[PDB]
């Protein structure tokens with residue numbers, strides 16, 4: 001079976017050919033970081049920084065999302081949420097709309113799980129997530145966010161383009177530690193608990209556009 | 220109204236005379252610690268140490284619990300839990316059995332709430348808890364616990380007697396920070412997130428008996 005009615009049909013091949021999918025899309029340094037020979041960094045207390053996705057997957061995902069066009073989001077009230085009201089709105093494209101939800105859940109179950117288990121000993125995960133999306137930060141439509149918390153055990157923050165080449169902005173700023181992240185990488189992922197002890201707030205961007213992929217795993 | 224069929228009837232007076240109850244049982248240094256002139260300590264990352272209860276309440280509660288006598292607990296399976304199986308058993312007396320549950324929830328809603336809001340800015344609490352109990356650590360019946368996590372946003376750990384005068388043991392040991400708590404005080408309370416980033420394990424006791432009050436608030 002092979003669905004050809006896609007811009008980039010190979011992205012949906014995580015269920016038929018896992019091995020070739022891993023070789024092509026997953027970052028080449030992921031295995032070394034998992035086995036524990038460095039790579040993974042802790043710039044600030046209890047936040048981790050490891051590579052997950054290569055350049056092909058980032059580019060392909062960004063192009064596929066931009067092909068959708070309907071960049072919903074911005075209003076305080078919501079229609080995609082059962083409650084019907086957002087605490088803080090952003091322009092986002094949830095994966096349920098584009099059909100990539102199940103494959104993303106499979107990726108979370110397969111690759112993110114074991115590493116976050118090794119990073120935090122004594123924690124057992126099922127990688128069950130409900131909210132996962134991609135946000136677009138542009139100086140024209142909407143600026144960065146106000147300080148807030150998250151409704152999850154921990155959050156995964158993956159970038160999807162290069163800093164300086166296509167945008168000039170910043171990452172995250174932690175209020176309780178005066179920690180500022182300056183230059184996030186392209187395929188690297190950020191891990192941090194997001195319920196109690198991490199009062200973070202994203203920095204504003206002034207030039208160009210930037211892409212970020214978020215997923216509130218273990219709600 | 221006044222129920223006299225109790226060993227110490229004044230403990231149930233948190234609903235009729237809040238002011239006198241506060242003057243008699245609540246620690247005299249609580250207000251200063253809440254207003255922020257020191258007192259509250261942070262011996263290890265993201266764990267706090269503030270006074271809550273005076274000596275009268277600790278003694279009165281310990282005597283009232285010991286009057287109950289039926290120190291249940293010890294078996295891996297459970298009957299007080301809907302699931303019917305404990306991850307780790309301890310000899311405990313849940314407050315539902317002694318009837319002090321509602322007053323304890325009122326105390327959590329009134330006094331613990333505002334302080335844990337000031338301690339962690341940007342966090343809003345309702346102080347809704349389900350599991351809260353008192354454990355007895357004796358070298359004969361059961362030793363200390365194996366490393367574990369907790370099923371709550373954060374836990375409150377209040378001691379109920381003096382170290383050295385009545386027992387010779389230890390407090391908590393954090394695996395992810397090599398943090399050891401040596402001498403917990405009598406009326407002081409311990410606050411720490413207990414889901415993801417705090418892999419703690421209690422120390423063993425060799426001489427005498429020690430009492431601890433725990434409450435898994437915000438499950």
Ligand SMILES: *[C@@H]1O[C@H](CO)[C@@H](O)[C@H](O)[C@H]1NC(C)=O
Pocket residue numbers: 028029
């Ligand atoms: C993987 O890590 C090696 C470290 O020796 C580095 O040279 C290489 O550029 C990395 N691959 C990337 C960043 O795609």
Ligand SMILES: *[C@@H]1O[C@H](CO)[C@@H](O)[C@H](O)[C@H]1NC(C)=O
Pocket residue numbers: 247248
């Ligand atoms: C309250 O704090 C003061 C600090 O000046 C101390 O002298 C006093 O003993 C404390 N009360 C206690 C420990 O009951």
Ligand SMILES: O=C(O)CCC(=O)C(=O)O
Pocket residue numbers: 135145150171172173200201202203212214
């Ligand atoms: O962009 C950031 O650093 C903040 C984004 C964030 O935490 C969120 O989108 O929930």
Ligand SMILES: O=C(O)CCC(=O)C(=O)O
Pocket residue numbers: 364369376390391420421422431433
């Ligand atoms: O004895 C202690 O201080 C740790 C016990 C504890 O937190 C627990 O038993 O869950």
Ligand SMILES: [Fe+2]
Pocket residue numbers: 149150155194
């Ligand atoms: Fe967040």
Ligand SMILES: [Fe+2]
Pocket residue numbers: 368369374413
């Ligand atoms: Fe605990």
